[PDB]
Every structure is written in C-alpha cells, then in structure tokens.
From TrEMBL, chain A:
Domain Ketosynthase family 3 (KS3) stretches: 3-433
Protein name in the entry: RhiE protein
Compartment(s) of residence: Cytoplasm
Source organism (scientific name): Mycetohabitans rhizoxinica
Top-rank taxon: Bacteria
Described purpose of this protein according to its UniProt entry: Involved in production of the polyketide antibiotic thailandamide.
Amino acid sequence: ELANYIAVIGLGGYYPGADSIDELWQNLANGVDCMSDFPADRWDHSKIYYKNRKVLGKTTCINGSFIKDVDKFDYSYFKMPKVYADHMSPEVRLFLQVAVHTFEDAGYSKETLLSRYNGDVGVLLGTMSNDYHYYGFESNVFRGSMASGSGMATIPMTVSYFYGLTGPSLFIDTMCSSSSTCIHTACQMLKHDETKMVLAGGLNLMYHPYTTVNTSQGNFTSITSESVNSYGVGADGTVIGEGIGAVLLKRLDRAIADRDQIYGVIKGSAMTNAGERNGFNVPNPDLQTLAIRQAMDQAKVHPSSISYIEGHGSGTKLGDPIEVLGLNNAFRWATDDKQFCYLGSIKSNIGHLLAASGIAGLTKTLLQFKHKQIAPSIHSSQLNQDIDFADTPFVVPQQLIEWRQPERQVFPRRAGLTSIAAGGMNAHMIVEEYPEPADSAGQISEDQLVFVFSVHKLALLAQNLTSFRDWLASSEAPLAQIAYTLQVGKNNLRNRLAIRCRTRQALSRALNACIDGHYQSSADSKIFYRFQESDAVQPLESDLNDPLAPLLTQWLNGDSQVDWASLYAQPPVRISLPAYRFEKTRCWYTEEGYESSIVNPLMFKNKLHPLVAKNCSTPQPGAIFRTDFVEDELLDYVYSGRGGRRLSAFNFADVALAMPALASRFDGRTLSVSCAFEHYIADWTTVTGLEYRLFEIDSEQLELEFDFRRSGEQPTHLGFAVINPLTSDEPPLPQQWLDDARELLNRQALQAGRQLSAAEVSQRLAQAGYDFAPYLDHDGELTIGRSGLVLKGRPPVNRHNHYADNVQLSPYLATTIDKALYLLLDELGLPQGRVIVRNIERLCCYHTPAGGFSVVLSGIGLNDNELSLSLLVLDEREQICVKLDKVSLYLGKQEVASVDRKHSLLT
Amino acid sequence: NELANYIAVIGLGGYYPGADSIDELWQNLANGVDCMSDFPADRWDHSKIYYKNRKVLGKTTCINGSFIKDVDKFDYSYFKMPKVYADHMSPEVRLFLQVAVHTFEDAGYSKETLLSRYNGDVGVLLGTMSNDYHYYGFESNVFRGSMASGSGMATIPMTVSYFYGLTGPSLFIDTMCSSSSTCIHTACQMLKHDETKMVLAGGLNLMYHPYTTVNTSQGNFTSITSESVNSYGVGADGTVIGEGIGAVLLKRLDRAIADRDQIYGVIKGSAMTNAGERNGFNVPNPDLQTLAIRQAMDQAKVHPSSISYIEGHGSGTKLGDPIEVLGLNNAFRWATDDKQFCYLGSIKSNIGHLLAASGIAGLTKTLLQFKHKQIAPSIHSSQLNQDIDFADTPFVVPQQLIEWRQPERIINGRKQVFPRRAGLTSIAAGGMNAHMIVEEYPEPADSAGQISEDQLVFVFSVHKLALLAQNLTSFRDWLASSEAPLAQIAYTLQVGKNNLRNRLAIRCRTRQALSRALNACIDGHYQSSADSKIFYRFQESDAVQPLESDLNDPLAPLLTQWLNGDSQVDWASLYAQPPVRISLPAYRFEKTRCWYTEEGYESSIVNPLMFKNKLHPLVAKNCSTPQPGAIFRTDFVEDELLDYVYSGRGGRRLSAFNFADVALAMPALASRFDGRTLSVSCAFEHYIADWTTVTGLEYRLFEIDSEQLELEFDFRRSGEQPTHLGFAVINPLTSDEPPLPQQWLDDARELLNRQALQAGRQLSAAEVSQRLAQAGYDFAPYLDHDGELTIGRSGLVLKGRPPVNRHNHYADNVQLSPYLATTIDKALYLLLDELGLPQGRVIVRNIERLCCYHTPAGGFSVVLSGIGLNDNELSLSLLVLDEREQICVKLDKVSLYLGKQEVASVDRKHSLLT
C-alpha cells in the first residue's frame, strides 16, 4: 500500500508576520495574532474605507494580513530583464522565489532535478486573484501605455521554464479549495507514476486597492471583525489575508529510497462538489461529510485514531456550525466518544488566504507533526454558541499542548485537513507523521567534509553566510547532513565558496572571516573560492591521494554536475537549510507615491472644486464656472430632510472661499466672505446644474453670482457673494461674544442647563425628517444655555472625497451648522421649522478642525420674520476656527405664527 | 476489462463563428469555408483602435478574427437568476452555461436523468485564457462609485455544477492554448480511475472588450499581415485569434456501450508533456512534442501506420509549423518508411486560433470527420510552407473533401484493417503539450430499440410560452431532414431534454402524423385528430389539455405524471429495448441582452482621456481669470499628439497650419459666430526648430468687437518663461463675399487636369518620398502617406490620402486636419526643392485670409500658385480640393521666410516665378 501514499518532502512559503517557516511556527505556537492594518506603503486605506456596502466604490474590509516586500523580485537571479519583471504579475515573481525555497528546502537544486529525474517534475497551483493587469489598463485609460500582468498559467509555467521541468505545469482554480485541489491532483499524478515529483501550492495577494473593493462587493467578509474567530464568536463573515505556499510531493516508496526528509504522509485525499442546494454560496454538510469519509476510507483509518483536524474554520455564523456538523457526521457513525480530537484553524492567526487556505493549513499541520505539539487556535476563548462541542468529537485548543499519540493500540499522530470553496468544491485529506530514520546522519570520513556556498551577487554573500551562521549555532543537525544538503540541495550559482573543516567551531570562525571580508583560512579550516562576478579566486591547492580535490576543483571551476555522493559511504538524509536571501530590488509598474484612480476617482480629481467642476469663461469680462449636479458624486454634501434632498447653504461659503485661488488672486491671504440667497431649494433632486460668475470689482474685491437649473428649465438665480482678503486691520472680537462662548463651552464641559445626549440629538433630527447617511450622520452633544447653544461635531475619519485640497469649510461642518440651527428652531418651539438661510455676513474660516469642534450660536434675536445670530466654531483646544458675525434666517408663514416669542434666548 | 481503459465521447456542443449549430460547422468545414471576419461593428469601431504595427502603444495590430454571435445575450430566466446578476456576470460563465445545456442534451441526459442515473456524480472541467468583463466595472470605478463586474475563473465550471446539482469535480484549468485538451486529458484519468461517472470538458475564448485585442497585440505572437491562419501553408507570419466555446461529455467506454449512448468516438490514449529546458519561454522543443505523441500512441496500443488523420495544432507561425511537423515526423518515422499516407490539417485554417478552446475545436472537427467518414480540406495551404519538406514525411495536407478510408497494412505478415483513427495535438506558448489518439466507433445494429408504435409519444417543454413556436419550428425543420427512427426521437426527447414548466405531448404512430401535429401546434392550433392526440400543461399560463383515464393504456400514467410536472418518470418502461441516444436540435434560449453598459458605449480604451479630457487636441483646458480675455493652456506631450508631430533634421516639428485649425476652433470655444463660415489670418513671430523641448502652449483670446476675435499664442520650455509664438485674427464671412479670382481658378483647373492626365513633370509617390527622406524628414507613425506631385509652369499639386487609422478618433472640432497641415508642409518643401533648395527650411511667417469651407472626407489635392519672391519672402496662394474637386480650403497668401543663402540660391529664372 506504500505506492498509494504520498510523502511531503519539501515545504516553503511567505506568510504575514514571519520571515521564515520556523518564525511562522513560533507565532502559531505562541498564539500570535498576525492580522494588521492595510499597510501605508501600498495605499492609504482611510481613502477607500467605508463601514458598509452602501457606498459603491469604497471597501468595507477593515484590515487583513500582509506579507512583506510584495514589490521586490530578484530579476537578475531568474535571468530576466528588469523591464520584463516590472510588467510581470507579482503572483508569478513571488511564487518563483517560493518555488526555489521549496525545492531547496527539500534538498533539490536545479542541477540535482536534472541529474535525478531529467526534469520530470510537475508544478500545480492556483490563486483567486491576479490584479496587476489593472496598472496597464488604467494607464491605457489615460494614455498609450504598456499592458501589465501575466496570465494565470504563466505562474506555474514560469517555474517549469526556469527549472527546465517536463512534468505537468497547470494552473487550477477551485476558489478557496484551490491549493488543496492542486495537492490532491498532485497525489493522483504521483500515485499513477505520471511524473516523479510535484510542486503544489497556492497564493493570495492584495497589492491593488481595487482587489479590496471587489472583495467587499462579493459580500462574504466581515464589516465588524478584525479577526477570523475560527469556531468562536461567529461573524457576519471572514477576513482576507495574504500568503504564498508550496509543498514538494513525492510518492512514498521513492521518498524512503531517496532518503528525503519526510514531514508527513498523505494517506488519503478526496474531493466532492456541494451539488443540489439552494444558493450558489451555500454549503451542503453531507457532501463535506462524504469527502471526509472517502479520505478516511482510502487511508484505511478509523476516526477514533484521528487526533487533530485542521478545519476550514472561516469564522462565519453559519459556515462554522455547518463545517462541524459535516465533521461530526463523518465521525459519529464509527464512535460515540466525545471531545477526543483537537480542532483548529490557521485562519485564526493569519486570516483566510483564499486559494492558499489549504496549503496554509497543511503547513501548520506539518509543523505540528514536526514539533509534536498542537498550537492554540485563537479568537475562540468563547466558542460559537450555535455549536454544542460537548456532543462532538472535537475540542478547540486554547493553549500550546503536547500532541500525544492517542491510545484507544497506541496510534500514530494522524490529522485531517479540510478546505471548502464558496462555489461548492470540498477537499479533505488524511495526513500522518513519519519517523526520522535511525541512520539519517549518513557516513562520510571527516577529512572529506566540506561546506559549499554559492550566491549570485557578492553584495549578498555576507548576509547569506550571516543567516547560515546563526542557523548553525542553534541547529541540531549532524555536520554530514549539512554538508550533503549544501552539495545537492542549493542552486549552484556563479560566486562559489568552500570551507573545508570538520567541527562546528571551525565552521563558525571560518564563516566570520568571510562575513568580515578577509577570508583568511584558519588552522582548523581551509577556505577556497571562485567568484566569477569579480573574477576573484582563492585557488584550491590540490593533492593526489584526496578524492575531494578534483570534485572541489570542478565545483569551484563552475561545473554544474559534480559527483558529491561518491564521497559518502552512505548518503545522509536531506534536511532543511536556511532559505537563500534573494536581492530585494523593487520591480513595479508605477512610482512609489502612485495612487490609482480607484483611490481618487475622476468625479473628484477632474474638478477644480467639488461644487465647481469646470472653467467655461468667455472672452467677456468675468470668469464663468459650471458643474453637473450628480448626487452620487457628492455624497459628502447632500442630505435628506422633510420635503426633499438638501445641501447646506454654508457650502456656498466654502465655494466663495475657494474662488480667489481659482482666479489666481489674494494668494496666501485668509478671507472674509458675505453671501446672500435669493432662492430656497427645498428639493435638490431635479437640479441638474450649477453656474457661477466671478467678477473683479477692484483689487480688494471679488463678487460671485451663482445659479442653478433643472431639466427643461431656464436658470434660476440662487445667490450672490462678496469676497475680501483679511488683515491685521480688522477689529478685536467684541468681549460680550467671547464671554458668551466661554460660558456656553463651560456649561458643556460641566453639563449644566438643558443638555441632550448625542442619542437624543439624533432622535430630534430623525423625528424632524432628517437623514444624514452615509457621511453626515455623526451627531454630537447639545448644550442649551441662557445665552445660546453649543453642538459638537466630530468629522468622520472616512469621507467620500479624499482628493480635494481646497475645501476650507467642510460639508460635515456646514451640515453640522444646519443641525445646530434646526435645534435652535426646535428649542424655540419649532419642532418642524425649516432652516432657510437668507444671509451670511462676514464669515472668516481658518480651517475645519480634524478633531472635534463646537458650534456656538449666540446673540440670537428675532425681528419681523428674521432670526439673526452669531456663530463660532471652536476646536477641542478652544481655538476659533470659524467666526461669523451674522447669520440671518428666514421664517416662513408657519414659523412666524408658531415661534415662541417668550423664550429667554430671544429677550 | 481493456475497454475500461478507454473513454467515449457521448455528447458534443458549442458555439463557433459562421455556424448556428454543430451541423452547420461541419458543412462549413466540409466545404472549405473561411469563417474569419472583420471585428464586428456592433461591439466597437475597430478603425479607432487599429494600427499597423506595434510601435504605437494603446492600439492593436490585430487586423481581424472570427466571432460568435450574440455574445451579450443570456437566458437569465432559464437559469433562475435575476437579470441584474446576469448583467454583472462574465459572458464566459453565461455562454458556457448555455453550451453546457446543449452538450448534456446532445448526449441525451437531462438534469433529471443525471440525477436518477448518477445522483449528479458528474464533473465539469474547462479553461479560458481571457475573462475581461471585470474591466467594465473597473473602468466605471475610475470615474465614479460603481458596481464591480465579472466572475472569477472557477465560477465558470461551478456555475454549471450548481445549476445541474452536480457532485463531481468542478475545476477551472489553464494551460494556455492547450487548456481544453488538458481538461479532456484530466477527465479521461478521472473517468478511468472511476472518480466520477461522467465529465463535461471544454474551453472557450472570447474578445468582447476592445482591450482584449490590445493586450493580445502586445503579446507579439499574432500576424500583422495576414487575415488568415495558414496552417502548414505559406505566408505564416504569426497566428490569428478566433472565438469559440466547446465542450464534450465523456464517459468510460464500457459504461457508454452498456447505457447505449451515442459514441462519437473513443479516446484511446492521451499524454501531456512540458517543453522543459530551452532558450526562450515561448520556444518549443520538438522532442517533447514527440514524447507526448509517442506516449499517447503507446497508451492506445496503436502503430503509427494505423493513424490516418492528424488534427494538428497548425497555428500558422513561421517557426511553429515546421517544428510541429518535425515533432510529428519524429513520432512516426521510427515505425515506417512510408511517406505522405496520413492526412494533416487544422480547423484553425477555417476559424482561427481559439487559444484555450483550440483543442476542443480540433476534437470537434475530428469527431465530425468520423461521423461522416470524410476528411475535410485544411484551407489556406494550396501553396505549402516552403521550409517543410512534406515528401519526407508521413503527411499530406488535404486540399479537398475526401472519403476517409479505413487504412489497411500487411504488418509483419498479417493483414490489418484499421478503423479510422486520428491523433490530435494542442501546444501552449509556455511549454505544455497535449496529444490524444481517438478512434471511430460503430453504430449498433439494433440502435432503433423496440416499442409498440401505440406507445410512441413526442414530448416537448419550454421555460417561456413565447418561445414555444420557435422551439417547435426548429424541431420541425430538423425533423424534415432526418430519417432517425421514431423510437429514438421519442426516447431522447423523454430522457435527454431538461423538463421545463410548459409541457406538450404529441401522441402518434408515424412521421406524417407528427409533422401534421407540429404544424398545428406551431400555428397555435393544438387540437387532436385521428392520426394524433395532443396534450399539454402550461404552468406559465395555467392552460391544460389533459388526457383521459384509460386503465388499460401503459402510456396514460406516465404521460399524466409528466404533464403534471413530475421529474422522475420511468419512460424506459415503455420500451422492450431502449433505443440508442441521438442528437436532437439545441434548445432555443431566449436572446435577452445582459450587459454592464448601454449599447453605443465606447471604453476610454477606444477614446483615452488624453483625447477626451481636452477641449481640442492643441487646447486642453480653459484657465481664464475674471479679467477680459479667455485663457487656455495645454501640456505639450508628444505621445498624446502622434497625429501632429514629425521629425526633420533640426528636430521635432509641428506644422504651422495646425494653428489655423486652433483659430478655427476658437469661436465655438467662446460661443461666437455659431454656424458662420470663418476667415482666419495669422502671423508667426518665432520658429521652433525642435518641439522636443516645448512643455506647454498658452492661448489668450480677445473680442475686439461684434465681428472680430484675436488670438495670441505662446509656448514654454521647462524653466523658461512663456515665449511668444504668434497671433491670429478670426472673422466671420458675410455673403457680401466675392467669388474666387478667375485667374486663380483657371490655374487650379489646369493643374488638376495635368494631374488627372499625368502630364508634364510628375514625381511618383516614391520619388516624393525620397525628396523628403534625403532632406531629413520622417512622418511616422501617422503623417506618412506621401502622394504624387505634379509640376506645371505656374504651380504645383500634391496629392494627399489621409490614412483610415489616426491617433485621435475622438475630437469633433478639427476642421483642417493635422494630416492636411503636414501635407501642406510637404508641398511647400517640394516647392523649395524645385526652386533649387533641396535642403530648404519651411518657415511659415504669415497666413492671410484662410477659409475652411469643408473638411475633405478622404483624398485631396493641395495646389500652390501665384508664387512670388520679393526680398526674403516667398509668397503663394493655396487651395485644397477633395476628390469631387470642390474647394475645401482656400488661402489668399502664405508667406515663407527664406534666409540669405536661401535667397541667393533660388532659381530666379524658374517658370514658377516668371
């Protein structure tokens, strides 16, 4: 039956929070959460983030997990021109590095694959995205440009090309189960002797911001959680992470004969599709169960003998319980025993790696075999309430524990691994530990020990050796396994170094003499090298009676096929050596500060100002600007009230402030503006445009007429503003006004007088028929005083438009003022009063504060049908950010008759 | 035992260019029909993105292709899906889903039958090299918040598996061009090892987004000269991409024989290899192709002499075709010294290279060859590839439709008659090779089965009553050309069509009765008669014409269950022997348009923002202030202005006449003189010898009064302040306007006649080209169609022919095109040359009274006359006329500046001045 089993002989990958596979294990073993924020060096996530799916074009993904150096690629090492690497998908580049790590980890240089198998090796992998082509597409939207990105099949075939492989090179996509499907396929290929080894794996990356927009619209990721709570407190959805992984697979009889490292044995694997169900993305537990049973059957293993399951564990309310039901039904036909098998998921640590979820899971499980420990499965200190684990075979491990061989006969450590595709595909495989051989150190005479290293760049030699020296200090491996694997399992590159010695001491000293750059061959070591890059040679002085002399002479001279094995009476078993340190040269289609239009779309960046799109001036005196009013381009500005969609009058204050720069005028000066409205737009729904006319009246003064229009109608005149530069010249603030604000702010910090919570402020606005979603609905506390009122605001971190750099008086602030004004109306006995601004006199605006602010209304008076008042906006340090001498409000028929003239505020 | 090693093809479907059914495709193949066509106008205007070579980034060199119809249409209702969902879904998923139905049904397996027989244990395996629908939503998101579009690759197979409730492996697999063959190969192994009961395998290629062709063009593997794939023929530069969607239903041979399926053919052996070590990612190794062929042959236990047809990759490249034939020869010649006994062709000659679908296309042709016992011609090979010595090979490329004989050989003393056997080969650019050996299979003697003719009923169902008449018409048309026994039609209708909500049954014993009844139903008269009884239940409208109780009649219960809407109905119990499945006509899906955009949409890829964000190609944006005058500014970027810039000795050049066009554009930019004919004069105050250094252009426009605009224009260079360039006056014409002076018209007349007659001193197009070349000009990529020059006593004329493909196909306010401006620069240079300045500099000082009455649609003539030399100024009058000889542009006077050594060098006695 050994011809039916498959050995994993090689393991590699890049994972978030770890620089090596062994660092990955320490993180797992120590329950480290490896999720993090979207990294600032890719894009600024605050510019595309929004809390729910209702604003199209943003993403609801709060965070993820990320590998380092996604843009780095050693193009020189893979004999590729740089311009080519710059245009090639990172999926291809980084998988190519991971492939070298996995072959090398297994103890198979390129040259050894040719010798042993004449390249008869397959490569199978999948990914669910490959978005690099967007760089060239987007550039082509603007200008004639080079396409970017690589076809999916280019990923495996480039590995096969670089390594000269003749076995099957396939890209396979089965969504989330893709890497497991590749692993399963590899096993069949190997079982039936179609190729001698297979490299199988997968990846998931998120280097383009649109990847997260598309993910968000797929509606399967959480909009609340920053973690994947595998079998714990179920979320609305999963969280996506990054990674790249591969295993090298060989049929078991052959791996034994070849004396490979065997991380574990795959003894059964099975796939099923969900089948008939109601909903594309809905699982059928029974078809999961079936794959699990087929895998166990094929492995000839009774389910009592399984002691660990690496579950899918994607973290959802409804997927997790379904998965466990699937597992339970796959066990309980054979036993009634409860909570004898551990159940976890690496998703808890690094998130859902989509196509790579299967290989990530297998990586953890193999690591557990190797250390004979079960890692914690985190974010599950509270277990999913819809799962009754006590009636299952399963316990979710909360700490690092000894993986004991279970007794029931003592059984070896056996695990099952499950991967589940959204679209229906399931995979389960049974894996078992394998014992290290008794004779794994091999046999070589000591005077024939030599340690050979090669790098492609002399710049990197010091690093590669430094990395190898520290690994050595804490390695347990016999010197003959290290020597043999260096000889047979490292790509033989152009700068070559040999250290002949027979102890660890000597090897370290020698290493340090090389790292320090002098290469003085000590008493306990001889150092030889040939560095073809520089032509430097420290020649081997050779001997007649010495089998090693010619072999070493060939290697140093650059030959690629040296009979190292002849030095050994028995070959040592292969071992894991530290990964080659690739050169980290950036290869990317764009400059580093680049922001895709996905971050700033053209509804923002094609406008001079969010409410002033285009200059349409004619040779006539005066400048003319025009804007198409499209509500969805202006989600920062428009809100609902009783009787229609609205937009603060104070936003036209921000337009008046922006005008002098649009006229190359009053540069660097801060401005006063007044503004008078001759019409009230109760419903902006059918407004199609805005027009502005700007006139220079003299050197000190600009005037702005503005209008709107609707489909089919002539223009309607809207308003008129006057804009002046500001100076030291203007009077000090009246003392009465500052006293009132001092007193109002103090009753807010102390909470005296009529006082409404944010929640109560929300209900008043809600019951008045206001809706401020998606960007204007953060409400603050209200203080009502003897002399006026204060309403706090806190601008959202995420707004719609993060491009415009000329918005001084922000729409959040503007709208916050509209709210203060309504609340004043309410306070004066007008719970339904319309806020109609007739006039604004002498508004100065330094900036909208990035933190909280307070809006203060005082000096409130009523005359005929006008409610006048003074307004200030202070920040959290109580620095005045806006000062506005007088707002005049217009009170309709109904407002005049209803208004409470008694009110203390008024008198 | 051994038959369990072989895989039967029991079903066949697809969509291919120039064919509305698989039968029509055979007819096209049998008749040698070229199915390539122009990029279709109902998708995009190819002339706006085409360029002849790869030097212009953003365009495509793809001349043509092949295309299926109705790439935008999808029966979302049949597939139980909201329309909005269908609209955002990749056509790859949508169309493969329809083809999957055709293929299951062609095999004779409804959904309900797949469930009863195998519990859905059926796999789905396909690939494609493109899925570009996501660009609609990406592009829209570049502009505004928008829904994403497109489906992931694995959504294609899993959607079929979802709709059919299948539990077998559902995989997307990409091995580039060999993808569909890799899928069929993989299916065979899964079926051999009994991992699943049947597999649907296939592939597809589509080009519905213009960018797909841009990306292909930059891949540098398609011909820039040929409108055909010349498989094994001459003129093989690079391949040409075609569209198609194909699948086959596969089952293990023993199971297929036992179930009495239609067996189109038997796959007896299949192997895959990768190219391995080699010099160049896209370079083949013929030895690894040979290894694949040998392994397939070994696996089928076939001697190479027994193979009588090969469906070659045949991609029509200069390097690939000889290499492929080398690989095939090496795979054969070890076994036989026979030459030219086996036919070799490729369906790519008819429909182009279907990339991932190349293999299932080739398999489709081969299975049709077996069915008809004929070898189809392989076209575009009447002259054979000159680097292939075919007489030293086993192979000949068939030029006609020929009968496929069972080949026969006495081998090692024993007469062997072999069945028709074919080898098929698919090759990927990146290394992967597939070869499979496929063999004809004989039709059973008793395929008609047995049933009492009283138990014949013909059952039909549709999802929408509105499509009923159409489906019955298509069945009736098929029926009129078919002699299939009635029992087989009845049974395949019973087990092999998805059972849908509107159900119709015609019960009758003969053809004549069935045809009568179909005619009736088709017309909406569903009444029974002596020779036929008609029953139905249309759940959609709730109309019922039920049968009556007959305790005796075997058909009553089953028919009642079926009409009532039951899925599990034991039709097989009517038959003493079940008939063999036959192919019935495809269901006619509703052709509703599901697309992300409206019809008429052009991607920015067609009109990029470097064109569409400008008010005019030379006038990007208004930057005016409140002071009188309008101000415009433009960033000078040569690559955004390929229509405009050329090279001369000094450097990069831009015709001065382009500024007359800018002036002509101005009054519309200022809302002035709408509709009126304009007159423009301009004076140039500086000559730019190399435009390379120019970074920007600035324009100031002023109203002098009612009837006059003045335009000032400057340029700037990096880190310099604006330099002045010139000054235009723009006035509208009155109809106070005198006609053209008579002399001037006489001269033009005579000169155009001299041109039409090829009279006097003429320079051919080639000579004019060398005059300019020897003077250091280069007009690539857009301004280089040099025409003939005619010189007479008093003027000259140069012919212009504006190329169909230019850089900017978006601007609508270009009246004097840059091609015409630059053609004027050429004429003026040729004047200088003829006056004795073969290296003369054209420096335009002044343009007096230019009117552009119309814009030539195509060809034109530039006429120079009234030529004078006064001090250092060469002045002339100029006309542009179109092919009808209507005056498009008239210009009283151009003034050229000549330097002093130029003034000394001119021939003062030349007739042009005399």
